Design a protein around this ligand. Sequence first.
Ligand SMILES: [Zn+2]
Lengths: 54, 53, 287, 286
Amino acid sequence: EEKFIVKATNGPRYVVGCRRQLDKSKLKPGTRVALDMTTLTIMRYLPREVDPLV
Amino acid sequence: DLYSRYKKLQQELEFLEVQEEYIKDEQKNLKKEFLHAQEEVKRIQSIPLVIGQ
Amino acid sequence: AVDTAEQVYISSLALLKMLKHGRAGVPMEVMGLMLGEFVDDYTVRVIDVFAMPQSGTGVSVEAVDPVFQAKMLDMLKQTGRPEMVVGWYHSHPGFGCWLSGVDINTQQSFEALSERAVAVVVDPIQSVKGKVVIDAFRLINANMMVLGHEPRQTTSNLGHLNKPSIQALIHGLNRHYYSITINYRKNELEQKMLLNLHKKSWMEGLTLQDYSEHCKHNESVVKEMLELAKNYNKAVEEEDKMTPEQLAIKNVGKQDPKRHLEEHVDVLMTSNIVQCLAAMLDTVVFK
Amino acid sequence: AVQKVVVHPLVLLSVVDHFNRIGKVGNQKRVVGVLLGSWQKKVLDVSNSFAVPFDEDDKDDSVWFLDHDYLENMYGMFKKVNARERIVGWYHTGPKLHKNDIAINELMKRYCPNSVLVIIDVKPKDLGLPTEAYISVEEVHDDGTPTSKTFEHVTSEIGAEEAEEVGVEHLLRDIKDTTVGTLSQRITNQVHGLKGLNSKLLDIRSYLEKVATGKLPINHQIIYQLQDVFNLLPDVSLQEFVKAFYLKTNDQMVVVYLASLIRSVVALHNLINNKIANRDAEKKEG
Ligand SMILES: [Zn+2]
């Protein structure tokens, strides 16, 4: 529940932790998130969209 | 030689007796170093990593 | 034509400034300047270390502003910092701590004043948090290729200089590019202030606050850890029921890398917290 | 407003530098340094700091010397190299709170935002936590005294984020980590009585002295809450807690069964190998 598996767009997969600010609401699977190069922390998520939806 | 073995042997009594607190120090300190190096090699294993096959 | 055995003294000032500068060690090239005092030939001591503003060009001689450098150095001269510059440092993330042509060119240009010209490259990006081993770099004379490379006496510390034994950078680029040993120094004020400061950093405010928290959590939260601990204990005893068959058949050789002993010893160590804190509750209840 | 603060050891080692660059002149007064931090978030986080030449007078206490150009130049260049940290307050190394600190802090109350104050000791002989966060806020008093600057104690913690833990751990090579178990627990359980004994014994003596030999109101109103909370535990007869001693002592019995049984399991390999190894090595030695 604290640390899960992430899938990067480039192809290699990683595992990250949980930031003390965010909660487990958006941490549920199936939601695209964002990561950091240092410590692989999570600042916020990334809501999906489409091309014609814009 | 017959009676000198007592007082001559007392030096071996002291030389072997002095090793007690010494081996106490080694057995009490080298395990502290064992948990020092143990936690040092344990903390190397970090959660952020790449998954292969 | 003379050479000695130099050694760079590194205190906690330059170390912690290179650790905060390593936290600010973004992939973009950074600049820094080291200060100190030259007392003799074969010793060098660093005291003052500050950072420099980043630039789009990166590490270069053009990025070093002489009016800004001399201005800040003058503001250090009007204060209690009467030390001259001794060298410049930077960060090389990713591609290794080695020095490119630009770095050796600005090193050749910056070594005209100071004959020593200490160079340090910090790289905490790919370095694990277990070791903070840092190395200082030096520039060799191009005219010494005919004679011996490094006529440095006291070859004992080279065994301590052999710790960075990467098989590509040190002797992969060791030609015209060598290094120097690094030692530390700590007085009693740093020892007791930083030692008691770190022990207090792992201790409480009044040191009596969080004791009863665990002494009374032994009855609420640790009970779950004791039941789960017994679940692991029985979960190993279910195999320890099968162990006397193999031990009653072969008795020769060991094939299972699991010891089944030290883990249970650790379980007993975690279980002894109740015993050690029972006397604590006895003291809190008593007086 | 602010519940707790976070002070990194870098500023206190910069106080070690304050004690290093003295030059053996014979002054060693309360050198004031410009504390820096992050006032954006509710929690305060000190990353680094610097100093300013500060000199007082021998007799007159109201003399204080600061600098605005040096503060704007060091803060301007520091903001140019790192704009993520801004001015927050200051701190002095003197162990005693002088009256002039309201005027010294008043300058950074006018020009800078609400400054936090930190009192430390010149000699690291105090076993307690050297850092005490004192917020500079004006509070209304019930006795009717005019409103003045009041220094309320804010709790503080000494922690390092990424690198200073590694640097301190490498420079010490003597301190130990958490290491739950026998030694780290029993050391706290041995020296804790002195950790409270030096604090309480060091405080109640001057307290009892200022009880009878005290004037210039020391806020005697809080003494009623002091003795009140001290009298909130009137030597309970332990009648109701007997069953709690049966519960904790029953957990003690659980630890007894775990120790005896598990150690009895550990005796297997020892009390077997001691025989099968000695008798076979002996019978096969010759
Ligand atoms: Zn580069």
